[PDB]
């Protein structure tokens, strides 16, 4: 889904350290990790940014969190983690294809950036 | 919903600057902001933390996000923003009632804590 490097990964055109996959999303380790465990859960549907997600995409967005929570458990993150969604410039969004970050394996700090 | 502070805000026992409310959630300003605009979206249903959300909770979860992106827009966060959900000790989760932070109004940095 899409014209970003994330679309290419979804189409298996380029490799990724794929963690989990179903009919509507894909989870894989972040190529530039900011913690001992740092992964991403993305919808196969190309939604460029969270700000343009439709009301109808509600449960799908919720599914990215459920999948993230499940993957977190199976990667051994028993002491906690942080989920992050970045939007546009001030938010530091690196790829215009909606993605949920999950970071753990270390004490995350405050503020969150 | 709950034995926490969020419980008191949901039961309207303690005041908060509400930005939006419906039958499923509440969105209000964080009293200790880490950015010019800093608010929380919480489900009225008491879910202690994300690690324990049920599969049936995914629609509710995506709703917190849909509501977050709408409020961010109403609050004028056109340059971007960052959404964060903290889980447990390593995640910095202070209050054990699920809540989504929305931060904006300034450049957010990387890593997010």
Swiss-Prot record, chains A, B:
Changing residue 80 to D: In NMAN; loss of homodimerization; significant decrease in adenosine 5'-monophosphoramidase activity; approximately 40-fold increased affinity for tryptamine adenosine phosphoramidate; loss of SUMO-specific isopeptidase activity. The modification N6-acetyllysine is found at residues 8, 17. One of its GO terms (cellular component) is plasma membrane. A motif (Histidine triad motif) lies at residues 97-101. It is an enzyme of class 3 (hydrolase). Its EC number is 3.9.1.-, 3.4.22.-. Changing residue 31 to F: Approximately 10-fold increased affinity for tryptamine adenosine phosphoramidate. Changing residue 38 to R: In NMAN; no mutant protein is detected due to post-translational degradation; no effect on SUMO-specific isopeptidase activity. It is found in: Cytoplasm; Nucleus. The modification Phosphoserine is found at residues 32, 59. Gene3D superfamilies: HIT-like (3.30.428.10). SUPFAM superfamilies: HIT-like. Changing residue 20 to S: Loss of SUMO-specific isopeptidase activity. Coiled coil: none annotated. Signal peptide: none annotated. Changing residue 110 to A: Nearly abolishes adenosine 5'-monophosphoramidase activity. It is linked to Neuromyotonia and axonal neuropathy, autosomal recessive: An autosomal recessive neurologic disorder characterized by onset in the first or second decade of a peripheral axonal neuropathy predominantly affecting motor more than sensory nerves. The axonal neuropathy is reminiscent of Charcot-Marie-Tooth disease type 2 and distal hereditary motor neuropathy. Individuals with NMAN also have delayed muscle relaxation and action myotonia associated with neuromyotonic discharges on needle EMG resulting from hyperexcitability of the peripheral nerves. PANTHER family: HISTIDINE TRIAD HIT PROTEIN. Exhibits adenosine 5'-monophosphoramidase activity, hydrolyzing purine nucleotide phosphoramidates with a single phosphate group such as adenosine 5'monophosphoramidate (AMP-NH2) to yield AMP and NH2. Hydrolyzes adenosine 5'monophosphomorpholidate (AMP-morpholidate) and guanosine 5'monophosphomorpholidate (GMP-morpholidate). Hydrolyzes lysyl-AMP (AMP-N-epsilon-(N-alpha-acetyl lysine methyl ester)) generated by lysine tRNA ligase, as well as Met-AMP, His-AMP and Asp-AMP, lysyl-GMP (GMP-N-epsilon-(N-alpha-acetyl lysine methyl ester)) and AMP-N-alanine methyl ester. Homodimer. Interacts with CDK7. Interacts with RUVBL1 and RUVBL2 and is associated with the LEF1/TCF1-CTNNB1 complex and with a KAT5 histone acetyltransferase complex. Identified in a complex with MITF and CTNNB1. Interacts with CDC34 and RBX1, and is part of a SCF (SKP2-CUL1-F-box protein) E3 ubiquitin-protein ligase complex. Interacts with SUMO1, SUMO2 and RGS17. Interacts with the Ten-1 ICD form of TENM1. Interacts with CALM1; interaction increases in the presence of calcium ions. This is Adenosine 5'-monophosphoramidase HINT1. It comes from Homo sapiens. The gene is HINT1.
């Amino acid at each position: 889904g899409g014209d970003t490097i994330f679309g290419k990964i979804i189409r298996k055109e380029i490799p990724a350290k794929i963690i989990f996959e179903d009919d509507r999303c894909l989870a894989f380790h972040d190529i530039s990790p900011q913690a001992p465990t740092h992964f991403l859960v993305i919808p196969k549907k190309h939604i460029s940014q969270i700000s343009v997600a439709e009301d109808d995409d509600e449960s799908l967005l919720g599914h990215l969190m459920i999948v993230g929570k499940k993957c977190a458990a199976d990667l051994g993150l028993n002491k906690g983690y942080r989920m992050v969604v970045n939007e546009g410039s001030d938010g530091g969004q690196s790829v215009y294809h909606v993605h949920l970050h999950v970071l753990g394996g270390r004490q995350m700090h405050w503020p969150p950036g």
